[PDB]
Amino acid sequence: HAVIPHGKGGRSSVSGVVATVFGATGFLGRYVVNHLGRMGSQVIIPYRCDVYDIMHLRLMGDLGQLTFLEWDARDKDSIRKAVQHSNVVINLIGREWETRNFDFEDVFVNIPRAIAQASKEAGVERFIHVSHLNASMKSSSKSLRSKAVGEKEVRSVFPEAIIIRPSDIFGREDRFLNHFANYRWFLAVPLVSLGFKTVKQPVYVADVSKGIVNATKDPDAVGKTFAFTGPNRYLLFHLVKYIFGMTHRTFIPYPLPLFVYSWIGKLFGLSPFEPWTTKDKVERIHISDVMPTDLPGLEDLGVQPTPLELKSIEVLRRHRTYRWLSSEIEETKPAKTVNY
Amino acid sequence: ITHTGQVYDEKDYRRVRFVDRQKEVNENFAIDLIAQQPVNEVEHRIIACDGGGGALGHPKVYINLDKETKTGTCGYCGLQFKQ
Amino acid sequence: TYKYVNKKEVDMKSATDNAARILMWTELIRGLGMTLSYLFREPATINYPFEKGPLSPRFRGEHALRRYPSGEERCIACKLCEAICPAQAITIEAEPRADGSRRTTRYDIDMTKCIYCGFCQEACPVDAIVEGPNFEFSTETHEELLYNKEKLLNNGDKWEAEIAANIQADYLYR
Amino acid sequence: VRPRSDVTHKQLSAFGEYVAEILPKYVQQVQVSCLDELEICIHPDGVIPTLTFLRDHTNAQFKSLADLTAVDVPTRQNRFEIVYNLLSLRFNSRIRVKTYADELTPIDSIVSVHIAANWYEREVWDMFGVFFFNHPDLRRILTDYGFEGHPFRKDFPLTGYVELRYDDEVKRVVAEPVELAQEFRKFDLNSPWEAFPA
Amino acid sequence: TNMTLNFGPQHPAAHGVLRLVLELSGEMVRKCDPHIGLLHRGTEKLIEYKTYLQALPYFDRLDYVSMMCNEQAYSIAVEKLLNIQPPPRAQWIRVLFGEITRILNHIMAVTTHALDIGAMTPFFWMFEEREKMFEFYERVSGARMHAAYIRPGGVHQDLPLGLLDDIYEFSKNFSLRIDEVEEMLTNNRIWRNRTVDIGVVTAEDALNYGFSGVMLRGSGIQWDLRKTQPYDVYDQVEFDVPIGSRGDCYDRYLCRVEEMRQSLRIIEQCLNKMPPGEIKVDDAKVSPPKRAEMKTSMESLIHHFKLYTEGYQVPPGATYTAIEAPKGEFGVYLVSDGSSRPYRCKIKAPGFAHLAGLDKMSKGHMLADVVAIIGTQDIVFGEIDR
Amino acid sequence: VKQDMPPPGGYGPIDYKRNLPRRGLSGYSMFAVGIGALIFGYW
Amino acid sequence: MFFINILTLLVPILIAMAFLTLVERKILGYMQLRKGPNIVGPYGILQPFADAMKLFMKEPMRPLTSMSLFIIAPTLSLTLALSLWVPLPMPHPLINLNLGILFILATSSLSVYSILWSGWASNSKYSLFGALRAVAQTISYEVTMAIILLSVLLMNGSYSLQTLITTQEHMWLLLPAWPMAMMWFISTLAETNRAPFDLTEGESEGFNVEYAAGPFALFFMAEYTNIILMNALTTIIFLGPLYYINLPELYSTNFMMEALLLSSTFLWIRASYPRFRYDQLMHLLWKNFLPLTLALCMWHISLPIFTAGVPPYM
Amino acid sequence: RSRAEYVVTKLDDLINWARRSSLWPMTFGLACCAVEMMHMAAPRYDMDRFGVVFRASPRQADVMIVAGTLTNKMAPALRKVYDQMPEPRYVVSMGSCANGGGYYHYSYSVVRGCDRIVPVDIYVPGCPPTAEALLYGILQLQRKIKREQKLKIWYRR
Ligand SMILES: CCCCCCCCCCCCCCCCCC(=O)OC[C@H](COP(=O)(O)OCCN)OC(=O)CCCCCCCCCCCCCCCCC
Ligand SMILES: NC(=O)C1=CN([C@@H]2O[C@H](COP(=O)(O)OP(=O)(O)OC[C@H]3O[C@@H](n4cnc5c(N)ncnc54)[C@H](OP(=O)(O)O)[C@@H]3O)[C@@H](O)[C@H]2O)C=CC1
Ligand SMILES: COC1=C(OC)C(=O)C(CC=C(C)C)=C(C)C1=O
Ligand code: SF4
Ligand code: SF4
Ligand SMILES: [Zn+2]
């Protein structure tokens, strides 16, 4: 079972990767389908969002490259038919909020384990599972701790299943960068420990995507637990200010106990419509980035990471005011890099 | 499957397009329809075949039903004629 | 022969006439009368789903492949329908069917490429490809618009009764 | 058979000599086609002079320029064949003055003689690449702002080399080398049998 | 740059693709540099790769308001190169549908002009009449617009049995419909203002910038290629060119309403005097054989097969043939090698010249004036962009 | 076999001329009725 | 009670405001040989409610612009227009104001800002150019609009709109002062930016350019309510509906009839006329109308005195 | 009934009815298929009757009908205007010249389809797609909207 790769390399060409991608509608997802579609791969995008929302993905895929299937996580049958004819399964299923009838363990662990079990039954050549970076079963945030439980299980449902483990991602439409920039509405921008001792290493979304895609088309990655990290680390302080810097909005980093702040996250979490901050988020944000000790990701998988400052201008431009939108990054001052 | 037999194997990718959808195939497969057509008996050595209806048929050809060994078949209608 | 579209005394009667035209907007009132008049005319619109705008037999509409009454598809793959298509829409590849006859393995009209010229209707010697009456075949996805032999043959079977009536009405003219 | 009126064939022929004598310089091969049409052919340097004489001569007033075009015969050393078609409202007649220009040997501009040519000359530069000196403002009229290559040249691929699609990653329209999903089927149509010229 | 703004391509004003960059000192236009090619599609290069009969459908699309009149120009051109001329009935047909098409264009130009000005009821009044005309096209060609009916050797198929009668009922009444528009716009106390003395073009300047259309006729120059150089049987009819004086948006308008009137005079005649006969040349060499003949006679099949698959095989030569399309002089310069597919086919578009004049017409004019002048040139971006 | 042609004797005649009617109250008469209205109103 | 009397006088007008768009999209239709909207609901009655819901649901995109001079502008437009119905004297008014017409003139004048604020807020060229011209003709027309009223008042005796019901107990103020009615009607057409005088936000898309969904709707609602209010002011000041003290509703019944017909008239004007040029529009007011109005203003200070008809104050 | 799922469906329907009854289109009017749309707006086939307004600017437009060839120069604009419309927006491609490439598919200046520049919801076929056909296409967009169930997915998400 395979498809000889013919063509010159662009759209309307063939690469031979038929791939179910269950959580494509996501920020990372959007990018994964982009490269897969650019390369000419056959992409099956399972969806449970309404057809109007899935429209953005149609255009990057060539005619007949993208197939959309109706799928429900609780219904095992839907996952069954999606992977029927795929040979690569990529799992990007996660939500930082715990919704009323999908709890954190269910989205991070139960849904992937069933999905991986299905492709072992189907006979998919490889499964790529994505879990957050620095994730341990006894870690601070449940999301991370659970995700850690998950990477284990899926190994037993699907052995030698690649497990890329990305850091918080930097990209347009990302949270890491937009969240902080959107603190503008808040007059003061709380920062636990005044934004210190939580050094963070962002990674451009595309780098992550390209990396993921390259995995699909490379035999070197099996059972590998890569870690796409980034080109430079940062104390949360510079990051926050830098953001506000490009956004050209004042910065008032205010110390507030994480204790009390976990409570603020609880407050937004209470909100019915997509809480903006999450108790589980808060912890994550002040959860220090772990030093790379796992399998090298970017570069190792073939893409050289892209510095944050380089593309930050595009992500934070909309956050900016009426004036200062023509302000460009090089007249602006890039913040210092703290490896710690 | 279809008139030609276009079919996708299990390992065959490019069969997903039908997942949760339907394929276009034909009942009344023509391959067998003229075979179902009776052999037009004739008296003359040669016969015409307007296709039926003149202008609304095929360019008229004259078939040589000269050998009972073979029922002439107008290359256009696939109609066998029995001398 | 030519004509001057706009090629051109002052009397109280005249002036008073002209001044009244400017002062009490006499010509403007004339224009209002015309629109009030139609307000009273019967509207020309048709209930679109219930009543349909009339199309006579030559309307080109949607492509279909016909079959002989016996049931053998008319096309014999001469492939000049492909030759004369202006847009390169029709793609035909053929091979001798086991019967020994000549038939098209694949006949694909790309309707998005097709500009509905109706020359294919013209060119076919057996008149296998015809411009069918239906114009309502709008589709949610681009792929549905690309049509293979099975869709066109199915289109032909569905509309054969009207296609036959339409060709019956217009063949003397052609 | 078309309703030829020899009355014309002669009168236009006679004018063709008239012009040939009036401008012995710059004018060669003046011929009246079998279609009752005259086609003075001029050396490229005679662009300004021959037109002006036709625009402003009592016995030949050719006030409006119907068209300026450039056939491209790749075989011909001078690739382009700039053709100017002109109309006489007063004499109810039309004439064709055609010159030859190579790719990098520019022709003079006649925007002075007829301002109609301001646009057509820009059209000829954009499509064929001939350049017109003394043109007020030469600039692409029909092709895209960043288009590279002159399209109507016989040596330019129909489909071209670039096509556009929207890319999400970059959230902006982006050229890519053309990749076509059904190449233009190049039917060979010439028949190996000629027609004995009448 | 006088707050230079670019007139919108999507703008309801314009025909959809006019990016008119205009530097405007407040509400006064200092300079208009129209941009073109928003609808360039390659029509001239594509034709070189197609046979004569498969390039006929391109001409309908060049300026599709005037669907057929454009075909007649290619027809005539291909007929000249072959030295073949269409049969008598076909000629009258082409003049019949040639004129019907002129009305269709003028109903488009006058009513669309008003919609940009702000009068919206004339468009709905006359689009119903248009609709009725389209139906003629459909019942003659098969397509509402983009017919492909006028082919290089005559018409494709004789008129249906009954069309002439209906092209009468309509013609018998259409006048009143033009009359109505009039009672709404010709003398409106306000139409005149926005149109009168806007975009005046001198006579000498109109010839110089190659206007060649109503635009010339509106300035008082008397030139109708249909009377000066008769094509088809427009010679056998009798009509009056509507010349204008004090050429300005209002005067030319009046001219377009008058040719709508004169075309009804030409249509009447064509119905009164159309001859019994054939509608396509009898030379199977140029015109495709009748389907009864190709299905019973060998020479006819061979001629049908070769004509559809290969082509006319026009003798080598070149011609510039111009008709009087509703917009103005539409001409095809068709250079042709002995091959069945053309070598060049520059389409002269009445419109490439007219737009150019926008600059010399709209000087020291307000934003609203520019909208009025694009209307008085009947710019269809298909012909300009080709 | 029949060919759609003009009816025998030709069709009837069509109008090719504007029939717009110059109908209006004369100006003096128009002003007088109006001025009379104001005079009555003022009184 | 008074609260109930605020629902009535508001809702009823809002519901009627919705039915005007419908009677606009049908009267324009039949004039143009088309049925107009009849498929949604019965005879299109549910049509106004339908797009209201579509408009509010669609995203109110805030341009990459002010965020207040953007949201203040539609609120001001709806607030002033609905507010000006407060003092209108149908039968007897809700809040009778001794200087009532000055209230109506002042409240109208304030709406010109909303146009100015929306145009500055959008921060795109089409909006600013449109707003500057729009503000210009609105206040230009205000100058003749005000003088035309001052002529009226001097023959009414007071600024209170309630007095005209007693002034017009024998004859409409159209008979006298018809020359100004016309000039009040044309000015009412300009101030509601309706057709003959609707250059802003024309086919050239001014202060709705950047306005979509909810903001679009509020001005929108405002314009149409105004369309009615100004017509209603014509139906009190110049066409005086018959008033019988014993039965107050025949006043409102005829007020209903005259207001609907004059509201129908500007609908009919729109379809019938092309739009005037920007300067053509100001040429009318400053050259054609202002000299007529100022002179007829003096005639209305003289008619009272020498005809010994000075109106009774109160 | 009160079980929320039912309540939700009904609400959604109302929302769908409002958007589906009043669709305000905008016509880029590229090429000619624009003439066949002006016919829809015209009296035989009144678009307004259905709730479709004759004209609308991009800010207030629910559906964009791309009529005509989307040439490479106009391709950046189309997008801009698509990107300048509200959150509930839709695109009805009209014409073989915009469904795919049409007679001008192999040209160097024509984008082979608008669905390469704007996501397309209903493709209306025909070189001059008949006005009735557009009307059929606009009506199928109305059935597409009717089926959309945005709040029920919210509730079940
Ligand atoms: C003792 C006696 C003392 C008193 C003496 C009185 C003498 C008689 C009265 C004299 C004045 C009568 C006319 C007053 C109003 C008209 C004023 C006027 O001149 O109109 C301006 C304009 C002129 O037109 P135009 O050609 O642009 O200008 C030419 C000159 N430059 O005209 C226009 O442009 C009009 C544009 C109108 C657009 C909308 C038209 C709507 C028409 C239908 C509604 C008509 C009014 C209905 C009123 C209903 C009741 C309120
Ligand atoms: N961006 C981040 O913060 C980072 C994320 N990651 C990991 O990468 C993955 C993708 O990230 P990102 O794209 O930001 O995540 P998103 O929040 O964009 O969601 C990803 C996808 O998961 C789907 N999904 C969520 N819940 C369910 C459910 N109950 N049933 C079915 N599908 C569901 C969503 O579909 P729909 O919304 O249509 O239901 C969405 O398309 C995540 O799983 C995360 O663990 C790693 C590092 C950083
Ligand atoms: C033909 O050119 C065009 C216009 O101007 C003439 C339009 O206004 C419009 C806009 C018309 C409608 C149906 C809103 C279109 C579609 C167009 O392409
Ligand atoms: S022409 Fe008619 S028969 Fe010959 S191939 Fe095309 S369709 Fe089949
Ligand atoms: S599709 Fe046919 S009609 Fe629509 S634009 Fe392309 S050519 Fe003109
Ligand atoms: Zn046969």
PDB file of N, CA, C and O in Angstrom, chain G residues 140-160:
ATOM      1  N   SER G 140     -26.346  73.396   5.609  1.00  0.00           N
ATOM      2  CA  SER G 140     -26.684  74.372   4.549  1.00  0.00           C
ATOM      3  C   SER G 140     -28.209  74.315   4.535  1.00  0.00           C
ATOM      4  O   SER G 140     -28.838  75.377   4.620  1.00  0.00           O
ATOM      5  N   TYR G 141     -28.779  73.113   4.465  1.00  0.00           N
ATOM      6  CA  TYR G 141     -30.253  72.989   4.368  1.00  0.00           C
ATOM      7  C   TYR G 141     -30.904  73.431   5.672  1.00  0.00           C
ATOM      8  O   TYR G 141     -32.045  73.905   5.635  1.00  0.00           O
ATOM      9  N   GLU G 142     -30.190  73.285   6.785  1.00  0.00           N
ATOM     10  CA  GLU G 142     -30.741  73.721   8.090  1.00  0.00           C
ATOM     11  C   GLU G 142     -31.038  75.219   8.014  1.00  0.00           C
ATOM     12  O   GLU G 142     -32.080  75.628   8.532  1.00  0.00           O
ATOM     13  N   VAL G 143     -30.157  75.999   7.385  1.00  0.00           N
ATOM     14  CA  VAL G 143     -30.362  77.476   7.358  1.00  0.00           C
ATOM     15  C   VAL G 143     -31.691  77.874   6.707  1.00  0.00           C
ATOM     16  O   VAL G 143     -32.400  78.682   7.309  1.00  0.00           O
ATOM     17  N   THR G 144     -32.040  77.308   5.549  1.00  0.00           N
ATOM     18  CA  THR G 144     -33.373  77.593   4.953  1.00  0.00           C
ATOM     19  C   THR G 144     -34.437  76.863   5.776  1.00  0.00           C
ATOM     20  O   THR G 144     -35.527  77.413   5.937  1.00  0.00           O
ATOM     21  N   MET G 145     -34.110  75.689   6.315  1.00  0.00           N
ATOM     22  CA  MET G 145     -35.122  74.891   7.054  1.00  0.00           C
ATOM     23  C   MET G 145     -35.586  75.786   8.205  1.00  0.00           C
ATOM     24  O   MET G 145     -36.801  75.982   8.354  1.00  0.00           O
ATOM     25  N   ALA G 146     -34.648  76.382   8.937  1.00  0.00           N
ATOM     26  CA  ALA G 146     -35.008  77.211  10.112  1.00  0.00           C
ATOM     27  C   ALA G 146     -35.802  78.439   9.670  1.00  0.00           C
ATOM     28  O   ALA G 146     -36.841  78.711  10.281  1.00  0.00           O
ATOM     29  N   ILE G 147     -35.330  79.156   8.651  1.00  0.00           N
ATOM     30  CA  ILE G 147     -36.016  80.418   8.251  1.00  0.00           C
ATOM     31  C   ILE G 147     -37.445  80.068   7.831  1.00  0.00           C
ATOM     32  O   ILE G 147     -38.356  80.839   8.148  1.00  0.00           O
ATOM     33  N   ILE G 148     -37.631  78.941   7.145  1.00  0.00           N
ATOM     34  CA  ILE G 148     -38.990  78.572   6.657  1.00  0.00           C
ATOM     35  C   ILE G 148     -39.901  78.421   7.873  1.00  0.00           C
ATOM     36  O   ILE G 148     -41.035  78.925   7.826  1.00  0.00           O
ATOM     37  N   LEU G 149     -39.408  77.796   8.940  1.00  0.00           N
ATOM     38  CA  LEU G 149     -40.212  77.664  10.180  1.00  0.00           C
ATOM     39  C   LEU G 149     -40.486  79.037  10.793  1.00  0.00           C
ATOM     40  O   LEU G 149     -41.626  79.256  11.209  1.00  0.00           O
ATOM     41  N   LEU G 150     -39.508  79.942  10.799  1.00  0.00           N
ATOM     42  CA  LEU G 150     -39.692  81.255  11.479  1.00  0.00           C
ATOM     43  C   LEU G 150     -40.836  81.968  10.760  1.00  0.00           C
ATOM     44  O   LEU G 150     -41.637  82.619  11.442  1.00  0.00           O
ATOM     45  N   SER G 151     -40.909  81.836   9.444  1.00  0.00           N
ATOM     46  CA  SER G 151     -42.042  82.437   8.704  1.00  0.00           C
ATOM     47  C   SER G 151     -43.344  81.823   9.223  1.00  0.00           C
ATOM     48  O   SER G 151     -44.282  82.577   9.515  1.00  0.00           O
ATOM     49  N   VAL G 152     -43.371  80.514   9.397  1.00  0.00           N
ATOM     50  CA  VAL G 152     -44.558  79.859   9.895  1.00  0.00           C
ATOM     51  C   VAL G 152     -44.913  80.384  11.255  1.00  0.00           C
ATOM     52  O   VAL G 152     -46.000  80.901  11.464  1.00  0.00           O
ATOM     53  N   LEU G 153     -43.993  80.269  12.194  1.00  0.00           N
ATOM     54  CA  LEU G 153     -44.291  80.687  13.550  1.00  0.00           C
ATOM     55  C   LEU G 153     -44.926  82.063  13.586  1.00  0.00           C
ATOM     56  O   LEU G 153     -45.938  82.254  14.249  1.00  0.00           O
ATOM     57  N   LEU G 154     -44.362  83.024  12.868  1.00  0.00           N
ATOM     58  CA  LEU G 154     -44.877  84.384  12.948  1.00  0.00           C
ATOM     59  C   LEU G 154     -46.327  84.440  12.543  1.00  0.00           C
ATOM     60  O   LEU G 154     -47.000  85.412  12.837  1.00  0.00           O
ATOM     61  N   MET G 155     -46.818  83.419  11.858  1.00  0.00           N
ATOM     62  CA  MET G 155     -48.234  83.388  11.519  1.00  0.00           C
ATOM     63  C   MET G 155     -48.970  82.436  12.431  1.00  0.00           C
ATOM     64  O   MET G 155     -50.160  82.203  12.256  1.00  0.00           O
ATOM     65  N   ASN G 156     -48.268  81.883  13.408  1.00  0.00           N
ATOM     66  CA  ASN G 156     -48.884  80.974  14.350  1.00  0.00           C
ATOM     67  C   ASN G 156     -48.903  81.633  15.691  1.00  0.00           C
ATOM     68  O   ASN G 156     -49.788  81.379  16.497  1.00  0.00           O
ATOM     69  N   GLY G 157     -47.921  82.481  15.948  1.00  0.00           N
ATOM     70  CA  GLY G 157     -47.900  83.217  17.192  1.00  0.00           C
ATOM     71  C   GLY G 157     -47.025  82.663  18.282  1.00  0.00           C
ATOM     72  O   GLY G 157     -46.775  83.336  19.272  1.00  0.00           O
ATOM     73  N   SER G 158     -46.548  81.444  18.123  1.00  0.00           N
ATOM     74  CA  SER G 158     -45.766  80.830  19.178  1.00  0.00           C
ATOM     75  C   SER G 158     -44.919  79.706  18.660  1.00  0.00           C
ATOM     76  O   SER G 158     -45.083  79.269  17.529  1.00  0.00           O
ATOM     77  N   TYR G 159     -44.016  79.221  19.490  1.00  0.00           N
ATOM     78  CA  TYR G 159     -43.124  78.168  19.062  1.00  0.00           C
ATOM     79  C   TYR G 159     -43.707  76.811  19.358  1.00  0.00           C
ATOM     80  O   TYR G 159     -43.213  75.807  18.855  1.00  0.00           O
ATOM     81  N   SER G 160     -44.761  76.764  20.145  1.00  0.00           N
ATOM     82  CA  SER G 160     -45.385  75.520  20.563  1.00  0.00           C
ATOM     83  C   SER G 160     -46.162  74.911  19.407  1.00  0.00           C
ATOM     84  O   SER G 160     -47.037  75.555  18.825  1.00  0.00           O
TER      85      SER G 160
END
